[PDB]
């Protein structure tokens, strides 16, 4: 089947999950076609009350997960860092890079009031912003910005869909 | 005595005002700052560290703002802490808006991805002993900035 | 369902797989079940030519895997430039033999938090690692190591050019 191929895949790439246009250069088919088996297979798993896994699409590619339900059972089992929740010092110096991305290590301490340096390692250490531009001043500072990991952590496919400040 | 910073402090202070955001109720506020900064470090002065550089913000303005009217600083330097507490609010609140946006990607679970393993497969040495060090050293911080 | 429970963990669990034992443990059910239920979870996906996957044992082992009928597109993937070098997992497992060596399996899974039996089987592939003895304790676990090869393959000549590292 398609539905098994791609599952199988999907399931060999597990966390990593892969993009619907690599997924055609190897089943050979359309990419407008692999959306609709994608579909598919995400509803066969949805119905079969004998399945506990789920299709997810996060940061522009589609990963093979576990049905929000087993969360109970598998968080003492797995722990995996995607899991882990973050301390509020990163979660919100991650928040200001997010957003006023790109930005640097002293921008952020002005906006948040204190020292980042800590939350900037942690949040670095997980991958989950990285050091891009660079800044010309008289201190040649570093910019700030997000990986592909923050769009997958967050659950979103672009940027933009990060809630709003209303 | 566990608040996120000094302008977490102030976003408690000027909370209980509730209303808008300001509305002059600054000359107040500012005191109730200072008496947590001197009764509290009349027997524990420990944890200070930054506070205190914010301590110093604070007396200008008390102060500056006596002198009649001479671009006024004695303003300025006011409404910018405004301004500071406001943005700080703003990401404290953005900051809550991920921590649940993330619980919800985190019901989620999957497999670590099977490492193939093929004959004909050759090595590309697109790595080197950068690379290696920067790996090894992150497991390293990863694991260790926890408990 | 108890089928849906299971397979979530044996889904989770990765490679190394997991035990009936503590299957039932998890789930809180008499190990005599959950191996029927093993049993037939076995067969659904043996009947579904939709599911990629059969389940299998490996001395005790309960894991996923595919099925052989796949072989051949997933050979391809594992041919994609991307794969082509090094995962994120087994730079990560070769680094911590290069700077631990002689360093063994269940040592090297302790510091990565979780099992890597695979990534250390595609380093012994590349002839990056290679067995080197046997720890000196019970069980007598391989012990591995870096090879000559990896010299080279790291564009180095001694295992002290490596950056230094001390925390």
Redesign the interface.
Known sequence: ?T???????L??????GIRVR?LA???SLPPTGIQQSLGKLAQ?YEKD??????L?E?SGAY??????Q??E??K???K???????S??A??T???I??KQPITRIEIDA?????SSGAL??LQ??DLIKEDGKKEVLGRPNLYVTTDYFL?????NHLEE??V?D | KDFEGPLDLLLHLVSKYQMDIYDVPITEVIEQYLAYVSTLQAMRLEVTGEYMVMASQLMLIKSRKLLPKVTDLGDDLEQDLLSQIEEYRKFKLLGEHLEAKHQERAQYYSKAPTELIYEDAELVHDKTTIDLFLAFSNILAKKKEEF
């Open positions: 089947s539905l098994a191929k791609i599952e199988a895949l399931f060999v790439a597990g966390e990593d690599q250069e190897l089943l066969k009350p004998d399945s506990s896994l789920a997810i996060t990963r093979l997960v576990t049905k929000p087993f969360a059972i598998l003492e089992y797995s995996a860092p995607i899991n882990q929740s973050l509020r010092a979660l919100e991650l928040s200001i997010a957003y906006i948040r009031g204190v020292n390692a942690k250490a997980f997958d952590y967050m659950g979103i990060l809630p400040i």
